Structures are given as structure tokens and as C-alpha cells.
Design a protein around this ligand. Structure first.
Ligand SMILES: CNCc1ccc2c(c1)C[C@H](CNC(=N)N)[C@H]2NC(=O)C(=O)Nc1ccc(Cl)c(F)c1
Ligand SMILES: *[C@@H]1O[C@H](CO)[C@@H](O)[C@H](O)[C@H]1NC(C)=O
Ligand SMILES: *[C@@H]1O[C@H](CO)[C@@H](O)[C@H](O)[C@H]1NC(C)=O
Ligand SMILES: *[C@@H]1O[C@H](CO)[C@@H](O)[C@H](O)[C@H]1NC(C)=O
Ligand SMILES: *[C@@H]1O[C@H](CO)[C@@H](O)[C@H](O)[C@H]1NC(C)=O
Ligand SMILES: *[C@@H]1O[C@H](CO)[C@@H](O)[C@H](O)[C@H]1NC(C)=O
Ligand SMILES: *[C@@H]1O[C@H](CO)[C@@H](O)[C@H](O)[C@H]1NC(C)=O
Ligand SMILES: *[C@@H]1O[C@H](CO)[C@@H](O)[C@H](O)[C@H]1NC(C)=O
Ligand SMILES: *[C@@H]1O[C@H](CO)[C@@H](O)[C@H](O)[C@H]1NC(C)=O
Ligand SMILES: *[C@@H]1O[C@H](CO)[C@@H](O)[C@H](O)[C@H]1NC(C)=O
Ligand SMILES: *[C@@H]1O[C@H](CO)[C@@H](O)[C@H](O)[C@H]1NC(C)=O
Length: 338
């Protein structure tokens, strides 16, 4: 028998002791080795209530990735609270590895196994684990990359679908590849996407949004302002910060069924996701830079004033990295064995 409780977690990883890669190096000194023989125990006659939007596991993983990034990414110049920090800025090797989050003695992790569980409310197929599965701390906006997929249906996850400032997390069941490259202006980059698969999955998601918003007309629109970090789909590829224009995906047109080519730029000055200010890095490395990533989720914000209007308007959201961890941690919760 158990009780809801918060506790300090510890991380586990398949990290290589001989790697120079920064994620491996952080987990070699901050995490344990993954359990060589994990045990999931299904708990019968048991229904449990979950809530991904009030889950302390998210804020603890957030804390970890903050610290991994400040130990691994060394910008030339940091501009925080008036201070201006000059540093060394060698190029690093960057490629995230899965992290597992594990309870200490006396506590345990309950797992929701309902395939169409939306994130809040009851779960009747519940298991028990000592560690979560392997989660990749991928930092990005608009699109959630290299994550896990919904088992059955596309799932809409939000704290309050009526609050328009409450972000929406769309969990796909079919991943779409995005192939982003800077070949051998050295900051010009691009991304290739199957419009065939994108527009079909996009149409499937607007069907899902009709269910939650009284059959109304779903309209996709580009971000209506902000810094480049949220107006573009931004991510780190091998240590370089990419900024990609995604208006061709957030578009209601679809003569369009081939490959979509998104324009991208590698930026050296960025607004940090940790909130601490600005940072400037060094020019990108020699040679072809290439990352192929799975799109497994979308982040969205709904427009306002349409209380009386016939349609609903959704634009690609992002910015708060806590929602990125929420999208992989939603099915877990820590409880104290009483
Ligand atoms: C409704 N949303 C609220 C909202 C909106 C925008 C933002 C926050 C919250 C937080 C954060 C504030 N910090 C700041 N303004 N300097 C700011 N996020 C970021 O700057 C950010 O993610 N950058 C970033 C860096 C690198 C990569 Cl690869 C990347 F993919 C993204
Ligand atoms: C509970 O979840 C498991 C794992 O996903 C799956 O086999 C099935 O949906 C459920 N099985 C039982 C016995 O409850
Ligand atoms: C999720 O399901 C619960 C009931 O299990 C319901 O109260 C809530 O409105 C649902 N939210 C969404 C976004 O579907
Ligand atoms: C991408 O998705 C496919 C299937 O959806 C899977 O086989 C592959 O391992 C995924 N890659 C990553 C990095 O998640
Ligand atoms: C994903 O879920 C949607 C329901 O929104 C469904 O129509 C679609 O067929 C599913 N795709 C797969 C591959 O199961
Ligand atoms: C969702 O937000 C609306 C708008 O403020 C609010 O009136 C409503 O109470 C919220 N829904 C819930 C279930 O709290
Ligand atoms: C990614 O794009 C590059 C350049 O367009 C190409 O050489 C490579 O084969 C692509 N990879 C995949 C998996 O499509
Ligand atoms: C929404 O539209 C579908 C169309 O298949 C219909 O079956 C359903 O009853 C409608 N719901 C509402 C609330 O109008
Ligand atoms: C993205 O491209 C469109 C034209 O396709 C352009 O109007 C828009 O300004 C671009 N996005 C940003 C953030 O500049
Ligand atoms: C888009 O996906 C389909 C799979 O349904 C694949 O056959 C096709 O090659 C992809 N697009 C391109 C341009 O190759
Ligand atoms: C997704 O995974 C592949 C292989 O694991 C990797 O090359 C790519 O860089 C990842 N995507 C991002 C955005 O890091």
C-alpha cells in the first residue's frame, strides 16, 4: 500500500566511460549504470489517479538538464543580469543519450499502461517500476524530437483546453522524419520532410482537435510574434543551434505531395532556454553537418477572442522546456510505500 509523495530521484544511463561526448561525460559522473535486470510488476485490482501537469518528476529532470548544459556547453560570451562572462569555447561533441529516473528505498514509481490515457485522471492498468524507461533530454521548440510515440491514437494533452494560454501537447502515433543539414554563407541550412506523410498526419491531428472543440474548424497558423527561438523550430544538432522556418508545415493549403524544404540558419547568439539571458558561440564546424530526427510531438497554443467565432486557431508553441519532459514523463508518478 502506498501514498503520494515527492522525493529526490537518481538518474541511470548506458553512458560510455571512454566517450568525450558531453552527455556521456555528465552521466558517467552524475548517474549510476542502468539496472542490469529491471523488474516491472503489474498491480491488479488497482486503479490510480495521475496528473502530468503537477508532477515533481518533471521539475527534477528539468533541474538535471539545466546542470548538464551548464557543465557541457561553453559559450564564448555569456550575458547574464548585466554581467558579461568571457570564456573559452572549443567545439564539443553533442548527441543526447537516454536517462533513466529511479526512486530510492521506501519509494517506487507507478506506471500508467492505458494506451489512450490523456495525462490526467484515473488509470486502471498500472504497473510498478524502480526506474523509468530511457528518456532523451532533447531541447527544442514547436516540434518534439527523438521521443516516444502514442501506442494507439493521437493523444491531446493539456491542463485546461479552455485556457488558451495553456499549452497543448499532441502525441503522435506515427513519427515523421525531419532531415536537417548544413552542407559543405556557411550558416545556410535546410530540412527535408515528406510532405506526403506530414500532411496526412497533420490532417489526422486536426480531426482529433475537432473532437475536443465541438467539431469546429481547425486552422493552423505560424507564430504571431516572439523571439526567433519560438517563431522558428529550434534545436541543437551536434552542438550547433539550428533555427528553421516551419510555415510550410503550419499551413492549411494541403500539387503538394513531395519533399518540403524548410529554410534554416545556424545562429551563434541565442536566447537561452534556462532564462538566464543571452549567449554567443563560435562559427560552425567544417564539413557537412547532418541530423535525422523523429518528429513524435507538436506543441501548440490556441488563439483568443474566437469565443463566438466559427473556427479555432492553433499556432506552434514552445519555449518552456518543462513541457518537453512532461511529454515523456506523463505516465509516471512517485509514491511512498507505506
Ligand atoms: C508560453 N511560453 C512561455 C515561454 C516562452 C518562451 C520562453 C520561456 C517561456 C522560457 C524561456 C525564457 N528565457 C528567455 N527569454 N531568455 C524562453 N525559452 C527560450 O528562450 C528557449 O527555449 N530557447 C532555446 C535555446 C536553445 C534551443 Cl536548441 C532551443 F530549442 C530553444
Ligand atoms: C496492461 O498494459 C500492458 C503493457 O502495455 C499490456 O499488455 C496491456 O495493455 C495490459 N495488460 C494487462 C494484463 O492488464
Ligand atoms: C482527460 O481525461 C479526464 C478524465 O479521465 C478528463 O477529465 C479531462 O478533461 C481529459 N483531458 C483532455 C485534455 O482530454
Ligand atoms: C524513429 O521512429 C522509428 C519508428 O517510428 C523507429 O524505428 C526509430 O528507432 C526511431 N528513432 C529514434 C531515434 O527514436
Ligand atoms: C493514429 O491515431 C489516429 C487517431 O487520431 C488514427 O486515425 C490513425 O490511424 C493512427 N495511426 C496508426 C498508425 O495507428
Ligand atoms: C479553464 O480555464 C477557464 C478560463 O479561465 C476557466 O474558466 C475554467 O474554470 C478552467 N477549467 C477548469 C476545469 O478549471
Ligand atoms: C538526409 O539528407 C542528405 C542530403 O539531402 C542525404 O544525403 C541523406 O541521404 C538524407 N538521409 C535520409 C535518411 O534521408
Ligand atoms: C461531431 O461530428 C460527428 C461527425 O461524425 C458527429 O458524429 C458528432 O455527433 C458531432 N458532435 C457534436 C457535439 O456535434
Ligand atoms: C518564414 O517564411 C515566411 C515566408 O515563407 C516569412 O514571411 C516569415 O517571415 C518567415 N519567418 C520568420 C520568423 O521570419
Ligand atoms: C513519403 O512516404 C512514403 C510512405 O508512405 C514513401 O513511399 C515516400 O517515398 C515518401 N516520400 C518521398 C518523397 O520519398
Ligand atoms: C535524433 O537521433 C539521431 C540518432 O539517435 C541523432 O543523430 C539526431 O541528432 C537526434 N536528433 C536531435 C535533434 O538531436
Amino acid at each position: 500500500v502506498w501514498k503520494d509523495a515527492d522525493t529526490t530521484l537518481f538518474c541511470a544511463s548506458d553512458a560510455k566511460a571512454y566517450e568525450t561526448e558531453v552527455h556521456n561525460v555528465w552521466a558517467t559522473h552524475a548517474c549510476v549504470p542502468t539496472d542490469p535486470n529491471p523488474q516491472e510488476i503489474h498491480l491488479e485490482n488497482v486503479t490510480e489517479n495521475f496528473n502530468m501537469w503537477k508532477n515533481n518528476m518533471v521539475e527534477q529532470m528539468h533541474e538535471d538538464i539545466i546542470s548538464l548544459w551548464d557543465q557541457s556547453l561553453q559559450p564564448c560570451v555569456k550575458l547574464t543580469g548585466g554581467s558579461v562572462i568571457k570564456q573559452a569555447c572549443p567545439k564539443i561533441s553533442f548527441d543526447p543519450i537516454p536517462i533513466h529516473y529511479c526512486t530510492p528505498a521506501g519509494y517506487v514509481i507507478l506506471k500508467c499502461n492505458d494506451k489512450n490515457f490523456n495525462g490526467t485522471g484515473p488509470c486502471k492498468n498500472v504497473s510498478s517500476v524502480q526506474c523509468t524507461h530511457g528518456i532523451k533530454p532533447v531541447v527544442s521548440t514547436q516540434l518534439l524530437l527523438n521521443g516516444s510515440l502514442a501506442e494507439e491514437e493521437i493523444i491531446i494533452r493539456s491542463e485546461n483546453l479552455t485556457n488558451n494560454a495553456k499549452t497543448i501537447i499532441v502525441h503522435l502515433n506515427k513519427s515523421v522524419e525531419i532531415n536537417c543539414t548544413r552542407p559543405s554563407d556557411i550558416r545556410k541550412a535546410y530540412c527535408e520532410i515528406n510532405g506526403t506523410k506530414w500532411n496526412k498526419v497533420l490532417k489526422q491531428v486536426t480531426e482529433k482537435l475537432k473532437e475536443h472543440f465541438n467539431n469546429k474548424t481547425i486552422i493552423f497558423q505560424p507564430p504571431s510574434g516572439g523571439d526567433l527561438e519560438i517563431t522558428m523550430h529550434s534545436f541543437n544538432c551536434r552542438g550547433e543551434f539550428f533555427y528553421c522556418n516551419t510555415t510550410q508545415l503550419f499551413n492549411n493549403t494541403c500539387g503538394c505531395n513531395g519533399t518540403i524544404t524548410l529554410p534554416c540558419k545556424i545562429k551563434q547568439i541565442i536566447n537561452m532556454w534556462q532564462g538566464t539571458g543571452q549567449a554567443m558561440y563560435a562559427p560552425p564546424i567544417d564539413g557537412k553537418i547532418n541530423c535525422v530526427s523523429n518528429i513524435t510531438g507538436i506543441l501548440l497554443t490556441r488563439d483568443g477572442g474566437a469565443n463566438n467565432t466559427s473556427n479555432e486557431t492553433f499556432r506552434p508553441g514552445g519555449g518552456d522546456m518543462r513541457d518537453n519532459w512532461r511529454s515523456e514523463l506523463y505516465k509516471y508518478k512517485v509514491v511512498q510505500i507505506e
